[PDB]
């Protein structure tokens, strides 16, 4: 019979008031003989009726992919409300119930520190700028780079790593042409996290 996977919303969607966060209940392995899926949604054990089902998607391996989407309020998610998706389908001996919420724990404020390239890296055509973000909880975060208002796309960010104090840390590395750094251009690391003032901070870097 079918299987169920329940996905949280993107940190960005939850941390920006101008965005719309949603939890997503994906049901895969739905048969051609029994395509009908009944969804029941609960928020802290209380049923809600505003979910919407996505268009049925044929997978070409004998099965359907059926997706129900539930809009959630920013504060509800961030306050740690539990969202439950219950799935019923004829090929199932018993309904499948999943549950997600923000990770439990007293939230903690990321410290953001910028790190200029090593003098020994100045041999290459390109240099590395670092943004160290440590001491945050939970692990839900967003990290980006900008210069002169425009976003800088040439970066890579590590996944969050559990530190010895039970908070997370990560590094983000922005790679730029050496000349841009030499010329005194300012680069900024933008971090979004629930425990920052207004869910946002920014640190800058130049020679």
């Amino acid at each position: 019979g079918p299987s169920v996977f329940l996905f949280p919303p993107k940190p960005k969607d939850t941390l920006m008031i101008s965005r719309t966060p949603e939890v997503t209940c994906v049901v895969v392995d739905v048969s051609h003989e029994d395509p009908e899926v009944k969804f029941n949604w609960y928020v802290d054990g209380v049923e809600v009726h505003n979910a919407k089902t996505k268009p049925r998607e044929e997978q070409y391996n004998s099965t359907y992919r059926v997706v129900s989407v539930l809009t959630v309020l920013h504060q509800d998610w961030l306050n740690g409300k539990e969202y439950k998706c219950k799935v019923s389908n004829k090929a199932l001996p018993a309904p499948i119930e999943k549950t997600i919420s923000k990770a439990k724990g007293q939230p903690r404020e990321p410290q953001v520190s910028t790190l200029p390239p090593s003098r020994e890296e100045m041999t290459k055509n390109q240099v590395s700028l670092m943004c160290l973000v440590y001491g945050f909880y939970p692990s839900d975060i967003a990290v980006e780079w900008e210069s002169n208002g425009q976003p800088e796309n040439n970066y890579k960010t590590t996944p969050p790593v559990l530190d010895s104090d039970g908070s997370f840390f990560l590094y983000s590395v922005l790679t730029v042409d050496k000349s841009r750094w030499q010329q005194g251009n300012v680069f900024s690391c933008s971090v979004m996290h629930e425990a920052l003032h207004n869910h946002y901070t920014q640190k800058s870097l130049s020679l």
Binding site: L15, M16, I17, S18, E144, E146, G149, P151, S190, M192, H197, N198, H199, Y200
Partner: peptide, 13 residues
């Protein structure tokens, strides 16, 4: 006050 990111509203308190 309010926070902005690339000319888009993040949050206000």
């Amino acid at each position: 006050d309010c926070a902005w990111h690339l000319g888009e509203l993040v949050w206000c308190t």
